Design a protein around this nucleic acid. Structure first.
Lengths: 116, 137
RNA sequence: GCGGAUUUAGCUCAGUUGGGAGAGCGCCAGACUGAAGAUCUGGAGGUCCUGUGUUCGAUCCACAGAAUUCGCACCA
């Protein structure tokens, strides 16, 4: 009950399952959601649909906090990425700006077994 | 009505339409005597309640066969509704033929039984795989 | 000996507006699958420790008894 009114909408999109974490201008997450939090096991969570439900719920939960506008920050590729976005464009919030803050590293990290 | 003309054919075994229409119209007669409603109106509603909307098909997509939900066409819903009503009628235990149809058309409006179990089973298979909804087709 | 806790359908347990006996698992069947599995649905399954009393009616109150468990007490 801090009525943030405006904040940021982090979208951790991945091939495993997208996870949304709404926050304020500072960066303190007010609430989050994920396909797993929606009830999905682990294989169906990656679906773009499980991303829409996670985006809307993560949003609605924030509606309670009193937030109206948010800034989406997309990270990492994967199904449900664009789905989570449009899911946010709707709901009860106003997407003021979208940004692809996907890290995509430079040079000094040994890739995992799957990547090597 | 063409619907009634189509329903009398599925009850026509060995080409005896004269006797077929005899049991049909005799059912609508006893149907109005048992229920205070027009035989025609009580007939249509009976076929409307027995119709699926989304059917799940099996498809090999790369590795295994996934179940993808798909919409049904209006031409098959009429056939199934007609077929499942006559089969359920021949399942009743009343000797009178016209009576098996009259009661079935009534219970079909009340909704409950095996035909309903299959309706729920299919409705359950659907939505259960909502994770495959994006494949509307 | 004494006190506390516990004593519901096979198992594990919920159940105090006293007036519905119920859930999970299990068992059987159905659906599904080539089929088996898993999941979903359905059914069966209860002297609800025992007796008596209290009320119009008690699993759900009182009293008495029994069993389980625990602390304590006893132990040339």
């Amino acid at each position: 009950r801090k009525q943030v009114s405006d904040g940021v909408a982090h979208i951790h999109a991945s091939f495993n399952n997208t996870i949304v974490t709404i926050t304020d201008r500072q960066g303190n997450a007010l609430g989050w959601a994920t396909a797993g939090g929606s009830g999905f096991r682990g294989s169906r969570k990656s679906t773009p649909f499980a991303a829409q439900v996670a985006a809307e719920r993560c949003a609605d939960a924030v509606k309670e906090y009193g937030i109206k506008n948010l800034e989406v920050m997309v990270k990492g590729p994967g199904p449900g990425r664009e789905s989570t976005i449009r899911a946010l464009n709707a709901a009860g919030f106003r997407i003021t700006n979208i940004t692809d803050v996907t890290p995509i590293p430079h040079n000094g990290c040994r890739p995992p077994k799957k990547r090597r | 009505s063409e619907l009634l003309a189509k329903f009398v054919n599925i009850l026509m075994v060995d080409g005896k339409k004269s006797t077929a229409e005899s049991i049909v119209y005799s059912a609508l007669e006893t149907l109005a005597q048992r229920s205070g409603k027009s035989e025609l109106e009580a007939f249509e509603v009976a076929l409307e309640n027995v119709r699926p909307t989304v059917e799940v098909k099996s498809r090999r997509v790369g590795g295994s066969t996934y179940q993808v939900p798909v919409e049904v066409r209006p031409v098959r819903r009429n056939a199934l509704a007609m077929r499942w009503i006559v089969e359920a009628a021949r399942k009743r235990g009343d000797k009178s033929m016209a009576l098996r149809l009259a009661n079935e058309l009534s219970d079909a409006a009340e909704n409950k039984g095996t035909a309903v179990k299959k309706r729920e089973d299919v409705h359950r298979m659907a939505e259960a795989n909502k994770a495959f909804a994006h494949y509307r087709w």
